[PDB]
Design a protein around this ligand. Structure first.
Ligand code: CL
Ligand code: CL
Ligand code: FE2
Ligand code: FE2
Lengths: 497, 497
């Protein structure tokens, strides 16, 4: 077999990116300032964190074993519980004490045959008393919200119709449905999209099979009262390339950014309309809604080039690190229109941004608040001379949060400081009676000065000021998505506005 | 109640001394070099590590909750398990989410009444299939060697005759007895010493009550074939001072360093002879043995002033930090002599030293190898300009290990580097046929450059060279004592030579 390294090497595991790989508990975290005593619930987040050194040199960040953090809040006290998802990969590599899974989404490079290749490392959501650890090439892994025990690969009582489950399901705050899909839904390189939903009782509702015009990456999607929307990243899969040891994904400069629109209820596959947006990168969806005219307003991060630059086109053509900016775009779609080409979107702010969150009490409906990561290159905001040598590589950089009020157009910016970077934030309603976007924001900080992580608590009344700074004595590696589960919500999801 | 701080403050919890307070697992630790594949067993060590900020300002290092590390070795792979001892203090403070136990060994400063005040933070030994977590003011806490679960306070099947159990019991490699004592054995300020032993079947053998000439600290003791030896540190307890909120311990410049000698088997309390060594500090015992003439050779660290300078005399007189050196002393004692005063000891090396270990296969018998911590002020050995600002306070410093061959007088020195310090080492016999002092030495390093801990593996053939350096991504706070439990030893202790 290819030799197993016994320590981490390369930029993707250097400095703040060095795996810690700890599982367990740190109770009664140190707090500077004061955590509001009324906050009760759990912040769950997932990070890719390789458990064993890869036999693949410069293995991408996206290929690391999913490690779940829970921050349990009550009466102004907070405890950390941390545990790896027991994926097939994790368990078999732990048994062998060496890496066995090969390149990102390329089973032809694996040293043994895997049934499930999930690292379960992208999102961690709450559904019917379980956590679901998500990776878009796989079904979810079900976990205990209290102990972070892994129950195992989850098939929704045998109802899961798809080999794949999106990392970005939407929770309808009115119907209490989980709205889902999977792409490559019949295996590697398939153009099959399976759109499916679960009612609050756990019974499957929608199941529609449709066909993508290309085998393109559909990372995120949008849900409105009457439509589901599938934006396709112009990364394209060729299985014959994979069989020769090549990348699952390859940029295609020659195709539009396709945006599929399907009726949400009772549709057949042929009802999808593949609208054609100007060529670009489909970032994360903030939210979508139908306006008075019945037009879909799709608000999402949008770049004009390949954000995933490490997967360039067939001729190795693509941007360099830190070159590509994504902007907060609004696309207008009319399902009734027979005109497939779409106009350039309007932009809601100027900031280089990503990781948009809304008040999920208005998810699938008109929202007027968005919280998002920003990356400001303006001199002094980040001390790059100090941070870059300590940062390692492979992960996106955010040096603040912004709150956009969509009605007033007012923007507040949180800057943690010149030697700190942020992850994706969560929003917490102040209480069950709170107005949209009124309450608390939490975000994990990388402190390059201490080489420690911190959890910031902000009040939406003034996003510039930390109400509390929770000081971890370890690093939590830069991660991906996370969610708030409020103690006052019996089903784990907030009540509609 | 006195207010509970919500973050650590003061020098004793700054820099490398900042509590981490993690419990759980890090498997498959990163290794530079190669762990010898034949090493099979577990290195257990204990550190004081406050679980909650103290309401006592500048609480000494010795007062922190005991946290147990196990390093489990097999086939050149190593896993860390880490867990706090569930002392009465730990459990009640965890339930309250605040500190309740007050000053070191002063129950009159506690915010609630404790039955047991142990932090179980000084030593961690193996006895008849359990770990015993030791603190000289208390009985042991019994723990599971595999899971580090705490069973609870241990009374040896109801046989424990003493309120107190030394942190330095001796294991007779021939008789397989655990030889023990406790001082202040009938409560705070009592001069009662209880000498007691357990046979390998767990049955109590010796129990002798004797009387100390002063209520002095007896931290360590020595055992030979026919004698047990009690060196008294001139720190003295006055319970009336403690009732007013004063220190348990106060230096007395006016007394000798008493060295009690008692027949090991069948003695009465009145058989003890209190020899009087020149005034000084009784450090850790390397080992004691009877020579041809039946004279006790007692080899131990010995200083001429108060090493525990934070507990000065009645007028606040004593040394400053880093002023007092301890030296590797040999005392000669003849139980038959009626002459109480003892000559100044001979010194085996010139190094400022402590934490002596021998090959425990010759414990209580003639030894010819000692491994010990050294602190070398020779310019360049430690980069003090870099280290001191990052070190915090309250813990002793060691910047190397030395191996003394007692026959040849040859000394090898291990220097981890100018920005690293060491803990107490362990010795591992190469195999059951190995000569005395032949095998492996392990020692935990504090790396002030990375602010991480490392576990060094040395071969006794050349102590100057690391065979392996195990790289922890977290800090293990400077700790106290530790022990090797070899897989090849059914009772957890090595076979006699
Ligand atoms: Cl599990
Ligand atoms: Cl326990
Ligand atoms: Fe995502
Ligand atoms: Fe000791």
């Amino acid at each position: 077999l290819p030799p197993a390294p016994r320590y981490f090497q390369g930029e993707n595991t250097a400095g703040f990116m060095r795996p810690v790989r700890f599982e367990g508990d740190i109770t009664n975290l140190e707090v500077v300032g004061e955590i509001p005593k009324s906050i009760e619930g759990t912040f769950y987040r997932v990070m890719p964190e390789p458990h064993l050194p890869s036999f693949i040199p410069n293995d991408p960040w996206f290929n690391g074993d999913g490690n779940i953090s829970g921050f349990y809040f009550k009466d102004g006290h907070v405890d950390l519980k941390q545990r790896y998802v027991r994926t097939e990969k994790f368990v078999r590599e732990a048994e062998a004490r060496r890496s066995l899974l090969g390149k990102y989404r390329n089973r032809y490079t694996d040293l043994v045959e895997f049934k499930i290749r999930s690292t379960a490392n992208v999102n961690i959501v709450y559904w019917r008393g379980q956590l679901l650890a998500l990776k878009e090439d796989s079904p979810p892994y079900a976990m205990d919200p209290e102990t972070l025990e892994t129950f195992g690969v989850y098939d929704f009582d045998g109802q899961l119709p798809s080999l794949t489950f999106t990392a970005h399901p939407k929770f309808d705050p009115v119907t209490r449905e989980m709205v889902c899909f999977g792409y490559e839904a019949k295996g590697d390189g398939t153009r099959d999209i399976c759109y499916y939903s679960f009612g609050p009782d756990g019974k499957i509702a929608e199941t529609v099979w449709l066909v993508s015009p290309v085998c393109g990456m559909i990372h995120d999607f949008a849900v409105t009262e009457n439509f589901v929307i599938f934006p396709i990243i112009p990364l394209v899969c060729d299985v014959e390339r994979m069989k020769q040891g090549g990348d699952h994904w390859q940029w295609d400069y020659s195709i539009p950014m396709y945006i599929g629109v399907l009726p949400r209820r009772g549709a057949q596959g042929s009802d999808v309309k593949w609208f054609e947006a100007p060529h670009g990168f489909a970032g994360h969806v903030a939210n979508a809604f139908e306006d008075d005219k019945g037009h879909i307003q799709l608000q999402m991060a949008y770049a004009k080039d390949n954000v995933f630059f490490w997967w360039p086109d067939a001729n190795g053509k693509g941007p360099r690190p830190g070159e590509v900016e994504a902007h907060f775009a609004n696309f207008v779609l009319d399902y009734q229109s027979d005109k497939l080409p779409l106009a350039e979107p309007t932009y809601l702010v100027d900031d280089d941004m990503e990781f948009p969150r809304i008040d999920d009490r208005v998810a699938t409906r008109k929202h007027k608040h968005t919280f998002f990561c920003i990356f400001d290159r303006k001199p002094g905001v980040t001390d790059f001379e100090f941070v870059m040598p300590r940062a390692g590589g492979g992960a996106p950089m955010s040096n603040g949060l912004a709150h956009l009020n969509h009605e007033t157009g007012d923007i507040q910016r949180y800057l943690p400081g010149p030697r700190k970077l942020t992850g994706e934030c969560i929003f917490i309603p102040r209480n069950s009676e709170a107005a949209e976007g009124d309450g608390y924001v939490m975000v994990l900080l990388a402190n390059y000065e201490d080489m420690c992580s911190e959890l910031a608590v902000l009040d939406t009344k003034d996003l510039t000021n930390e109400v509390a700074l929770i000081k971890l004595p370890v690093r939590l590696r830069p991660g991906l998505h996370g969610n708030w589960v409020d103690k006052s919500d019996v089903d784990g999801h907030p009540a509609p506005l």
